[PDB]
Symmetry: C14
Subunit: 79 residues, 14 copies
């Protein structure tokens, strides 16, 4: 009844809000990672390795909001 309607919105906002910060975060990090590559091309293969560890780290932040959204939609215990 109500719970079915409630968990369904919490599934929308969980993934809706989660992408706000990291969406911005990965942006500055990647862009600033590129500018450095442009400045020092010889450091490229060395540079991405950090940007990669970095991008994955922030990508996990929106994953938690994605997982809880699905645990709300599919694996919901309360309905």
């Amino acid at each position: 009844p109500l719970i079915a309607a409630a968990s369904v919105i919490a599934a929308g906002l969980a993934v809706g809000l989660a992408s706000i910060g990291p969406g911005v975060g990965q942006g500055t990090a990647a862009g600033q990672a590129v500018e450095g590559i442009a400045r020092q091309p010889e450091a490229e293969d060395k540079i991405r390795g950090t940007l990669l560890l970095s991008l994955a780290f922030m990508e996990a932040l929106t994953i938690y909001g994605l997982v809880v959204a699905l645990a709300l939609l599919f694996a919901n215990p309360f309905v």
Copy 2:
């Protein structure tokens, strides 16, 4: 009844909010990726490769909000 109306809005806000951050994020990253190419054209083929890995990474952030929006509209378990 109510759930049908609730999941339908959560489908709107999920994809509505998801695009906010990465929309900004990809912007700074790409633009800053271009400026570097302008500075060092010889590094172009080397530069995009990072911008590409970067753009895809952030593009996945709005995908989660797109997928949940569809799982709300079409594949909805609660209706």
Copy 3:
């Protein structure tokens, strides 16, 4: 009844919010792509190619909010 009124607003906000971030994102990227062209005109044909891949990438972000908005208005399963 209610669902018809609910899905109709979720169609408005889906496309309303989707344009916020990428609208800003494409702005900085394009403008910064132009400044570099002004600095290095000889790199133009090389520059746009990245800005193009970039602009399309962000243009897809508002497409998801456009598609869900239409799937809400026209192809709505819940009404």
Copy 4:
């Protein structure tokens, strides 16, 4: 009844919100496109071509909010 009142507001906010980001986006891009022309007048005919592809790209973002607003007002399936 309600749907007629609901779709009518969703038509207002769809075009209301859509203009926020790109309104800002085109601003920075164009202004930054001009500054470069001032710096390098000889690159003008070369510069606008990118700014044009850019401005149209962002102009499409508010079009989606305009189209859905009209599809809400005029060709509204739900009323």
Copy 5:
């Protein structure tokens, strides 16, 4: 009844919100267009031409919110 009161507010917010972004956008673009003219007066007649194409482009963004506002007030199909 309700629809008459609903479409009347959607007419207020449509033109209310539409001016936010482009109001800021045209500002930076024009101001930055002027600074460049001050720097290079000889480029003036060449500069405005881009600022003009630019200003009109963003002016169209608030037009969509103006048109829908009027289509809500005067040409309203739902009342």
Copy 6:
């Protein structure tokens, strides 16, 4: 009854919101137009001409919110 109270607030917010962006926009543009005049006084009569075309352009943005506000207060079709 209600419509009279509804159109009356939409008249308040239409002109209330419209001034936000352009109020900021004209500010940066004018101020940046002055700084350039200070830098190059000889370009003054050449400079204002662009600032004038610019200021009017943004002044029209708040006019649309002013006109709709009046069309709501005085020329209201719905009351």
Copy 7:
């Protein structure tokens, strides 16, 4: 009854919101107009003339919110 209470708040927010943007706008413009005078005192009588045309332009933005506020309080047609 209600309309009297509604138009009375719309009179408060009309003048409340109108001052936000231009309040900021005139600030940057004037301050930046002064800095230029400090840099080039000899350009003073030439500088203010633009700042004056500019300040008045933005002062008109809050006038529209002031006029509608009064047309709501005193000259109200709906009460």
Copy 8:
């Protein structure tokens, strides 16, 4: 009854909001007016004259919100 309670809040927000923008605006302008005086003390008597015309201009913005607030509290026509 209601109107007495409504006009009383509109009196609070009218003067509450009015001070937001100009409060910020006068700040940047004055501070930037001072820095210029520090840079060029000999221009002081010449500088304040612009800052004075400027400060008064923005001070009028909060006056409109003050006047309407009082016209709501004391000279209220609707009560």
Copy 9:
């Protein structure tokens, strides 16, 4: 009844919001007024005079929100 409860909140938000902008405004102006004094100490007595006219000007902005707040609390109505 209601009006007594309504005017009482409008008294809270009037002084609550009024301090937002000028609180920021005086901050930049004063701080920027100080930096200039540090740069040119000899201009001090000349500098404050403008900062003073400036600070008072912005201080009046929160006064209007203070006065209306009191006219709501005491002199109500």
Copy 10:
């Protein structure tokens, strides 16, 4: 009854909001006042005198919100 509950919240928000702006304001002013002292230690006793007049000026802004909060809590005329 209601008034007792209403004046009690207005006492919370009066002091809650009052500290926002000046809290930021004193911050920039003080910090910028110290950087100058670091740059010119010999000007210290001369510098603080302005920072002191400045800090007190902004401290009075939160005092008005503190006084009204207390006049709401203790000296309340309406209960």
Copy 11:
């Protein structure tokens, strides 16, 4: 009854909001106070004295929100 529930939230927001601005304010001031010490270590004992007077000044801003919060919780006259 209601007042007990009302004063209890006003106690939460009073101390909740009070820390926003000064929390930011002390941050810039202190950080900028240390950068100057790094630049001129010999001025340290002279520098902190201003930062101390400054930090206390802003610390008093959150005290007013703390005191009113307690006067709401413990010394509450209205319950």
Copy 12:
């Protein structure tokens, strides 16, 4: 009943809000960590070690919002 619907939303917002700040935080830190590596490649193995301790530190911030979200969904004491 209600608690089941309440804890379900608190599970959505807990993980929704938690990612906002650190999402931005890790972004600036990582990106700034990369730029330094580009500047000094020889410091890379030395640099990441700090960025790693840093990234984990901020990653724990969204973990608390993830854990409470799950403790709300799965091991919920109140239902």
Copy 13:
């Protein structure tokens, strides 16, 4: 009854909001404190002493929101 539910949320927002500003504040201060140490390592033991006095000062700001939150949860007089 209600008070128990009211004081329980005020306990959540008190500690929820309190961390916003100082969380940002300590960030800039510490980071700026580190950059100075990097610039002048010899000043380290001298530098932290100010950063320590500074960090504690801001840490007290979130303590007030923590204490009131607990005084709401545990030592609550109103239930």
Copy 14:
């Protein structure tokens, strides 16, 4: 009943909001701590020690929101 539903949301927002500021704060501090290490690798072991004291200090800010969230969920006195 209601308290069980109320304390459950206050548990969500307490950790939801707590991470906003420090999430940003640790970001700037850490990133700025690494840039300095890149500039002066020899200062590394000296640098982290401050960044560590700093990171922990801000990490405690989200701990208070985590603890109260748990004291709301598990150790709740009011249920």
